[PDB]
């Protein structure tokens, strides 16, 4: 009983995640998480009828996908045509006790799944990790502003898309005054989204919602 083996733990030193709409990294495993570990999140499609999604696996602490370490990329396709947001692409990052990162994307509606396996770097990589941590600390402000702009644009894009769906469904029951007001606000929001002014995007989202209440009633009344 005198002899024994030394107990160690593997920890991820940098967040792990995938690229999502807007070129942003979305984290599935937090920095400083002990191995083994398994995390999953559900994602969906960005357009109606989209038949595939790209899963681009990233490691690092920056907000722009391009500024993190690319670990791998694969597609899940054969997604049958559906409205945006209907597919349920569950993406699971599972790192086993051997440091192997297993990435799965499965459409839970259909059971269709694709996978990749990413091996761990053979030690030592202290300088690489340090350089990535430093790079994120130096740019923490700029990255934060990028992330907030992307989030804002994606929210405006969400409001734009579901409001348009509700107009289309409202059809001729939408009075012309309302139709014109909403359509005009849709255009103004669409223009704000091309900007870099978060306040202006939020202002146009609020103006759109303010003129969309008759619409929501009809939408609610089939």
């Amino acid at each position: 009983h005198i002899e024994g083996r030394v107990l160690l733990l593997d920890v991820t030193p940098l967040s792990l995640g995938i690229e999502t709409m807007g070129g942003v990294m979305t984290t599935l495993i937090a920095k400083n998480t002990t191995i083994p570990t398994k995390h999953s999140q559900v994602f969906s499609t960005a357009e109606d009828n989209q038949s595939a999604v790209t899963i681009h696996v990233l490691q690092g602490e920056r907000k722009r996908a391009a500024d993190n370490k690319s670990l791998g990329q694969f597609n899940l396709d054969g997604i049958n045509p559906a409205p945006r947001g209907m597919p349920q692409i569950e993406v699971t990052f599972d790192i086993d006790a051997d440091g192997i990162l297993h990435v799965s994307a499965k459409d839970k509606n259909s059971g269709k799944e694709q996978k990749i396996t990413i091996k761990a770097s053979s030690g030592l990589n202290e300088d690489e990790i340090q350089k990535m941590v430093r790079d994120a600390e130096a740019n923490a402000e700029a990255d934060r502003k990028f992330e907030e702009l992307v989030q804002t644009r994606n929210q405006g894009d969400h409001l734009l898309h579901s409001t348009r769906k509700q107009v289309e469904e409202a059809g001729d029951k939408l009075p012309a005054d309302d139709k014109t007001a909403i359509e005009s606000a849709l255009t103004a929001l669409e223009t704000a989204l091309k900007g870099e002014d978060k306040a202006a995007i939020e202002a146009k989202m609020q103006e759109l919602a303010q003129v969309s209440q008759k619409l929501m009633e009809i939408a609610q009344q089939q």
Partner: peptide, 6 residues
């Protein structure tokens, strides 16, 4: 659900 592109 965040969104993914092709």
């Amino acid at each position: 659900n965040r969104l993914l592109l092709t």
